[PDB]
């Protein structure tokens, strides 16, 4: 058929991008946590989101090393399971905290008098407990299936999902594609729809209540509508390449891509993943340090 090769520059770039996003994510969300915890609503969502993003990116040097050694994992089975579990749990918890912010903002902004009770019952710490347990459950298949192995054709140890814990070789594709499509739906399509809806209604309200005739209202109008659009656009731009390339590539096992498309997908996928890790680096500035009060807290503490 066709040969499946890596772009030579990938084994040198991808570790660099992993370590770079490790540094940016760790420092940004460590600053966020140091401010939240060592000094209003959204502070529980900001704290959960910072923990999620920090632990999302904090185990990346292991996969940077795994990549720079051409996929040879010198860390044991425990650490495949643990690293991969944390990277998946915190993917989910990132997305679920963003949806929780969207929903709590909907309840706080759109019709605040009517949805006060509901905001008490279903937002705050309730939503965080629920999203952390749901993220911890939905990511167990990687705790139970992710193993180290050595394709003897290489003499190298590599983390891999085996699926012969659960399936025969003629039913492994059902497991691959089912878990992939479940992950895509629960991790992109439902939370994105909720974030988009909530921010549409928050934007209608912000555009209706800040009258553009008085100049200060005009400034706040532009500032709030801008950031709403940027939150939504950043989530999509950071998380949609990964999900779309993943979906197309797995759907190419049922179909037959011309294998030039297949090589392009197989090779561009690492960088789509590295883009999805940039959301964890951007979230502090989109959510926590967008607030001048929080910035001045952090800086007056530092400075």
């Amino acid at each position: 058929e066709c040969e499946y090769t890596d772009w030579k520059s990938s084994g040198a770039l991808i570790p660099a991008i992993y370590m770079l996003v490790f540094l940016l994510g760790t420092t940004g969300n460590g600053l966020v946590l140091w401010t939240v915890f060592r000094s209003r609503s959204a502070d529980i969502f900001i704290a959960s989101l910072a923990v999620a993003d920090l632990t999302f990116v904090v185990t990346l040097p292991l996969w940077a090393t795994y990549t720079y050694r051409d996929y040879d994992w010198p860390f044991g089975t425990f650490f495949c399971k643990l690293s991969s579990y944390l990277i998946f749990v915190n993917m989910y918890a990132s997305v679920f905290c963003l949806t929780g912010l969207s929903f709590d903002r909907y309840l706080a902004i759109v019709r605040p008098v009517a949805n006060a009770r509901l905001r008490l019952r279903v937002s705050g710490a309730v939503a965080t407990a629920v999203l952390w347990v749901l993220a911890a459950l939905l990511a167990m298949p990687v705790m139970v299936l992710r193993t180290t192995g050595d394709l003897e054709n290489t003499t190298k140890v590599q983390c891999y999902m085996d699926y012969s814990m659960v399936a025969t070789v003629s039913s492994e594709w059902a497991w691959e594609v089912g878990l992939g499509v479940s992950s895509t739906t629960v991790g992109f399509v439902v939370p994105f729809t909720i974030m988009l809806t909530c921010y549409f209604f928050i934007a209608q309200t912000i555009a209706g209540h800040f009258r553009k005739e008085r100049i200060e209202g005009l400034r706040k109008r532009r500032r709030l509508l801008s950031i709403i659009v940027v939150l939504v656009v950043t989530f999509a731009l950071c998380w949609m390449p990964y999900h779309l390339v993943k979906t197309l590539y797995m759907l190419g096992s049922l179909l037959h891509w011309p294998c030039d498309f297949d090589l392009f997908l197989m090779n561009i996928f690492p960088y789509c993943t590295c883009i999805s890790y940039v959301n964890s680096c951007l979230n502090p500035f989109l959510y926590a340090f967008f607030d001048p009060r929080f910035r001045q807290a952090c800086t007056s503490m530092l400075c």
């Binding site: 998946f88 891999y160 996928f269 993943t273």
Partner: peptide, 13 residues
């Protein structure tokens, strides 16, 4: 392994 991208990255599926 069944997928080629089961390894090669932290995201398993």
């Amino acid at each position: 392994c069944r997928p080629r991208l089961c390894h090669k990255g932290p995201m398993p599926f």
